[PDB]
Amino acid sequence: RSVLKNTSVIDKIESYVKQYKPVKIDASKQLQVIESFEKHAMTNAKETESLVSKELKD
């Protein structure tokens, strides 16, 4: 900022950056749908895991 001797805008866009300093948040919104996908996955997984454990000893 001390580079520009005729400054006039650096405090303006400085305040513009500090305005948008709470920039924008992300989304860990998935707490309803992702549990459904891991539910189907763990269901099929435990079914297959117990099935092959039975079929090996059979």
Partner: protein
Amino acid sequence: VSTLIPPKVVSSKNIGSAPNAKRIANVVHFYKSLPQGPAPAIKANTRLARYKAKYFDGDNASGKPLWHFALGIIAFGYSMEYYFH
């Protein structure tokens, strides 16, 4: 864009594949088979089963009873010779 899931789809897979038929065939083929020639009943007697056991098994299998049966016809008609001529 998402997690694909073919590691665990063996649930309704294990009917369709081809050696499943051979597997379910010989699990049925192997249970009721007697173990080691058991329940053989190697001796039985009905006044002629000893004749089969001495002559007509897989072990002896020699043509001698035929020979005996040949002599049987030699035993038969010759006596009828003494009844006829």
